Design a protein around this ligand. Structure first.
Ligand code: ADP
Ligand code: C5P
Ligand code: MG
Length: 191
């Protein structure tokens, strides 16, 4: 059987990695964070590394040929699993490249959208910034990540919503309250 795929979207610091860890724990899906895979690719000393580094710091979206390749490598290595793909698609190019490369391999089911205010997301990330040692957890970068979300990614969420394919969870609540709804949703979808 073809894998089920759920895209996990929402702003920087909306809690995507956090909720995805919980789903992995209770449902046994594999968690693919596109941002983390792109970091890993840079730390592994490829030709694209200096490119990826710069784009991450500036909150720009890497060319899809890089990203879709890393997601596909991991997907092909885990036959018989279902996938949470987190922080992807972030723009139209991401999306077109997914449907060009993945369409008859996967059953992409819905977009799980974590809706959260910008001011709350800012505070979360400045707190993760003390200990994360990430290049994009400073105020300069966070604001660049917001704008890219606003200009590029919001259009993608709209696209999936006109096919009734977006499920929205409000994420400005306690972590366990947010997970309660996430778990209820995944159970109701038959997973
Ligand atoms: N519901 C929440 N309330 C408060 N802190 C949270 C909540 N969800 C996540 N966090 C914290 O917010 C920060 C960002 O979480 P993360 O899952 O990495 O976000 P994303 O992947 O969407 O950028 C982390 O420090 C995390 O521990
Ligand atoms: N689909 C994706 C996902 C992440 N990214 C890059 O990785 C950065 C970090 O992503 P996360 O916030 O999701 O960890 C993004 O802000 C962006 O610069 C990307 O270029 N393409
Ligand atoms: Mg993340």
């Amino acid at each position: 059987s073809k894998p089920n795929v759920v895209f996990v979207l929402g702003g920087p610091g909306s809690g995507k990695g956090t909720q995805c860890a919980n789903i992995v724990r209770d449902f046994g899906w594999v968690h693919l964070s596109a941002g983390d895979l792109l970091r890993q690719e840079q730390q592994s000393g490829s030709k694209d590394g200096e490119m990826i580094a710069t784009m991450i710091k500036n909150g720009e979206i890497v060319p899809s040929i890089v990203t879709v390749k890393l997601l596909k490598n991991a997907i092909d290595a885990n036959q018989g699993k279902n996938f949470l793909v987190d922080g992807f698609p972030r723009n139209e190019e991401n999306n077109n490249s997914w449907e060009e490369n993945m369409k008859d391999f996967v059953d992409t089911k819905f977009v799980l959208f974590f809706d959260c205010p910008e001011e709350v997301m800012t505070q979360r990330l400045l707190k993760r910034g003390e200990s994360s040692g990430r290049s994009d957890d400073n105020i300069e970068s966070i604001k660049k990540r917001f704008n890219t979300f606003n200009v590029q990614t919001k259009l993608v969420i709209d696209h999936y919503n006109k096919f009734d394919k977006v499920k929205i969870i409000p994420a400005n609540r306690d972590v366990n309250e947010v997970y309660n709804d996430v778990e209820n949703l995944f159970k109701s979808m038959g997973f």
